[PDB]
Design a protein around this ligand. Sequence first.
Ligand SMILES: Nc1ncnc2c1ncn2[C@@H]1O[C@H](CSCC[C@H](N)C(=O)O)[C@@H](O)[C@H]1O
Lengths: 141, 478
Amino acid sequence: QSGAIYVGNFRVVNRHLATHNDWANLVWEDSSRDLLVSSTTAQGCDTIARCNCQTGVYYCNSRRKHYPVSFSKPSLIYVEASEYYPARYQSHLMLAQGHSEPGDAGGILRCQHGVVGIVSTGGNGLVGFADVRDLLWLDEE
Amino acid sequence: SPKEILNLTSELLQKCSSPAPGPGKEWEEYVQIRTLVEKIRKKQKGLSVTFDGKREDYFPDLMKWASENGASVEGFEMVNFKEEGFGLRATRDIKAEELFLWVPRKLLMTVESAKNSVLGPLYSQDRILQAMGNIALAFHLLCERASPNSFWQPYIQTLPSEYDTPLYFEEDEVRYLQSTQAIHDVFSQYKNTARQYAYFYKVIQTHPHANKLPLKDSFTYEDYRWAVSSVMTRQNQIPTEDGSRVTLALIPLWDMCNHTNGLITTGYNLEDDRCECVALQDFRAGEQIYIFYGTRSNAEFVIHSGFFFDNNSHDRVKIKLGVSKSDRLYAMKAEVLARAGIPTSSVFALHFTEPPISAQLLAFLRVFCMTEEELKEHLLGDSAIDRIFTLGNSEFPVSWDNEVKLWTFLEDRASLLLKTYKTTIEEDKSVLKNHDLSVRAKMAIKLRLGEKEILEKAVKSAAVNREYYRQQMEEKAP
Ligand SMILES: Nc1ncnc2c1ncn2[C@@H]1O[C@H](CSCC[C@H](N)C(=O)O)[C@@H](O)[C@H]1O
């Protein structure tokens, strides 16, 4: 559990937890998705799912365990401000019930066909996942 | 062989391969498929492999085999509960958050286990088995059920003989669910299941890699019906050994725990390579150990889990809403849908618990009664980024007058939806108190009641919210 999706020559992670080197090797960013993609030299062994699976398992860092969740569709959802992002439009946020506390951002959500998303938001007994399946450009070259 | 079944299945694939005949005509297509299945079922010996004893007689064997591989077998026992069937009963006091179950992956039946078993050569060539694990896991269950020298035999021998899935229901039992939304999904269960049985009974007879399978000697419908019903009712997703992706899994011992409301407490610890369930609440000595199966609707509970849970706080019914192409305001509203993540039309849900509407259905229904001026208020200005964000916030009303429209629309639609049902809410309450229904009939009717019970809370809330915003015109507040 690295807290990031490693596929091909690309490294995907929450935008608000990225290291400066990620911006040094910036490929694409979006504040409206809490998603940052950086270039790597090694070949990551994570497969991007192109499924519409809505039942997946996510890692809870505070519980150090994987949890199955039923999450809604990639949708623009209200997120109240926290120490990282003041409330602003946030799209492609799949919401499900589970335990997600500060530090759990980075849990990799996966469908039977591979990775679904990565934890972005939490609170009120819910866990938010930033979708990635959409970015086909995120594949092998 | 015989191949009469192969001819009887040949028709099922084709008929079940047809698109929907329409609404009102689906029941006729349903009974068309059941009759053919019933002919096959009454021409087959039922369950290919039957256990000599009764179910509970194989529970001690389960614990030893599990204990031989490191599963928690203390703190609970096997008891036949009236309301939920067999379950786990605490043999001691279990506190909240107390971890009381751990099951190594070696005991779990996973698709990765399927690809490594005798089904693996068949999985290698068949794309449907490759695609749908719920089926692929079902065949893994059946393959090892017909294998006397199987590691997982103690688990299979504890599994039930029948289930309360609509696959086991009778025509009178499904007759109660007409004019409801769930029955449109109950059909999809039967149709897809039947179709899969027809496809797979052929492939076992034709595929060389299936020659070594014990299913070539017997692969009845009651086999397959039990199989997928076993999977859909007690499956849990876990990561694979590589952790790169997830896989379905039949977690032994953990699956006998029945359901009560609450939060999901069952996790898998890849570091320890095992499943761990912590207690949802305090389980005194002699109290049944429950777990939380998930935030599923009572429709999904009947169809995928096989029971109706009273006081479910996550019950909801779908509602199809869309922008009619007869709208002068389509192009201006066609912009929001791509930037607000809303499709042109889709299935939305009315929820039992407060609030009946969702922040996403309100994000659809608000825009469904806006004027031309308020459509440029979200698109042009320094508040256009902040306002589209606050499209689901009830305390940010986009406009006072639109509110009453949206509750009026729902007042019309919801009252219409009550009319669509063949019975009334009042008649359904009496039938449960006064009639002697089958275990399965009680499930289906309570759902048809529930569906109407959901709307009745949506109607009065819409009524309560409509009168509220109507009161707002007098004060003329900012
Ligand atoms: N609230 C509930 N009411 C009735 N049956 C329930 C239930 N929650 C779970 N179940 C049962 O749990 C089954 C899945 S496995 C759970 C263990 C069950 N005692 C058994 O003997 O298999 C479901 O198919 C259903 O029969």
